Design an enzyme around this catalytic site. Structure first.
Site, PDB file in Angstrom:
ATOM      1  N   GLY A   9      28.179 -13.268  26.204  1.00  0.00           N
ATOM      2  CA  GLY A   9      29.291 -12.760  25.407  1.00  0.00           C
ATOM      3  C   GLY A   9      29.719 -13.455  24.117  1.00  0.00           C
ATOM      4  CB  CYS A  10      33.083 -14.564  22.988  1.00  0.00           C
ATOM      5  SG  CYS A  10      33.999 -12.996  22.911  1.00  0.00           S
ATOM      6  CB  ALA A  11      29.657 -18.413  24.708  1.00  0.00           C
TER       7      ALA A  11
END
Lengths: 348, 348
Positions: free
Chosen positions: A136-138
């Site tokens: 995801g956002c990482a």
């Protein structure tokens, strides 16, 4: 290995803060926590977001199969151009890349786009594919840390990082919790592509990277996978996690010497300025430090894995060139995971 | 770096060829190509297959949401036990592990199971996590190559490769095509795990891993993503692809001085004795060199990415390996992709 000029492009359909509030109001007039929802969204400071389909179509849910069909069509017609401008900047041809790193959590396809990209973009029939859909956002930071690890292992190797995120395709009319409502006013669609030539590029200079998993937070930023697709779940406690993460940033910041937060470079991705501001305190830099990150969110919203890349892209346009100023590139998402990266700016 | 004894565990619910044929008959009694279908299945030589749910539960489709819940529970109660044995054989504790490369294409979760592992497994809070879900039957090989590259970048690195595959969770009662009927008789469930120690350890030593992508074959081995989950699509022309792929193996073998097309240790995963034989001719070698792969398929069926590992497991168990003997490890899947790896045996 040095990170070059990330190329970024967003879809033409725009949704303003005001519009978001109207829809949310009209679409949830009876919601008991409505006023709270609207306030939270507005405080986010996200003035505009871009989506791949007109607003009336993105609000409709034609099913996960059709949604995912839109995902591949939009990625095939949009990704190519961006990759190009990323090669032109790093000064390479499709054929100078040894490994492609494709990150996306907003849709699912097997094979990933990498195969179709090698075929059409005329890439090396030997290019390694590294598709990661579960970070995801990482994923942005993780892609960097990978292209990096790769280059160190093959010094003359050039990696291509591609981030494709169509968060609007994960909109679920059914999710009625205030957390969901929040998310619906925060995430946007965006595509980023950046090259990392180890040969000797111009941009951020590779140093030491590292990961860190916040204990017992596995279900804090996750997907519920249903017949309707991916339902995003973000625990109310996510921002507060900034306290436990700050040290992890210092710990690694130290094992490099640059050690102190007292840096000149800060390109970190955090969802919404709320979480970003807890990082400007627990760490103790300065709010203004994450000016580039906050800029992406203000104009594009949270475009997942592509945020870090776009922040950099904005650091290039203002491009001072402080030459060899410290540097901290980090990404946060599912895990809770943190892909941190320390590096100096390099000119050439 | 040296690949160590991969541990493998398959679920307790067994399904034989005989019953597979009975079910297919009972359920597709009116299918126009029922005769073709049964002959084809019976011809793969897959004697038995292991599934995670009893056959009665496996056959019903409670929906993608539930199916995926079953994926998570099963992975949590079975992966740890298998990772334990892998850590033990390589002789270590979860803390010498610098990274976890998790491959699986039969279910989807974000974060992937690596996050959960890191915690319960008592793993090191800084353990890197590389989850790949879009490489299919070729993920087993890709994982080995990625563990490789990592140990190069960091010589003191110990990479953990986990391959979890519950193909039965991707059974789609609605897919009636003959290709689907065939797959329903070929794929099984299985979990593999192996440690790649850059330092000590006994097994196959690294020494040149490459990759190849057969042009214009993107939709030949892929997934259709629907409200019911993943519908597996295999093109009838895949076995023939062995013709254009054989030269891809020699091509990379010579680059290491060992092509000629006559190694001393073969461990390749194609996807059915069909494809395997075409390879044992176009590569011009006796099919007996693939006996280790064939055993896995005969006893476990096609356990996707876990095949190469269980194939290696086969070799270990029999030993007799020339401490110095040349070798090949390869996986084939969606792309069409081919992750290859050349290496010599070794002892501590």
């Amino acid at each position: 290995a040095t990170l070059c000029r990330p190329s970024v492009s967003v879809p033409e359909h725009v949704i303003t803060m005001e519009e978001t509030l109207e829809l949310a109001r009209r679409r949830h007039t009876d919601h008991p926590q409505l006023p709270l929802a609207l306030r939270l969204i507005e405080n986010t400071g996200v003035r505009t977001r871009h989506i791949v389909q007109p607003i009336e179509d993105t609000l409709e849910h034609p099913g996960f199969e059709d949604r995912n069909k839109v995902y591949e069509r939009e990625a095939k017609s949009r990704v190519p151009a961006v990759i190009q401008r990323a090669l032109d900047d790093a000064e390479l041809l499709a054929t100078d890349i040894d490994v492609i790193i494709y990150v996306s959590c907003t849709g699912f396809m097997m094979p990933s786009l990498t195969a179709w990209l090698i075929n059409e973009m005329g890439f090396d029939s030997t290019t390694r594919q590294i598709p990661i859909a579960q970070l995801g956002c990482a994923a942005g930071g993780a892609a960097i840390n990978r292209a990096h690890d790769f280059c160190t292992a093959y010094p003359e190797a050039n990696a291509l990082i591609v981030a494709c995120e169509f968060c609007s395709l994960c909109y679920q009319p059914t999710d009625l919790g205030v957390g969901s409502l929040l998310c619906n006013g925060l995430f946007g669609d965006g595509i980023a592509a950046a090259v990392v030539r180890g040969r000797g590029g111009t941009g951020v200079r590779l140093e030491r990277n590292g990961s860190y998993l916040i204990p017992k937070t596995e279900d804090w930023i996750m997907y519920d996978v249903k017949a309707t697709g991916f339902h995003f779940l973000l625990d109310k406690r996510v921002p507060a996690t900034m306290e436990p993460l700050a040290p992890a940033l210092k710990e690694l910041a130290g094992e490099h010497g640059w050690d102190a937060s007292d840096l000149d470079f800060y390109i970190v991705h955090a969802g919404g300025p709320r979480i970003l501001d807890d990082l400007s305190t627990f760490l103790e830099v300065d709010p203004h430090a994450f000016r580039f990150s906050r800029a992406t969110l203000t104009e594009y919203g949270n475009i997942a894995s592509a945020v870090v890349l776009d922040a950099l892209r904005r650091l290039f346009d203002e491009g001072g060139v402080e030459e060899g100023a410290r540097g901290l590139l980090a990404g946060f998402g599912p895990g809770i995971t943190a892909e941190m990266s320390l590096g100096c700016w390099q000119t050439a």
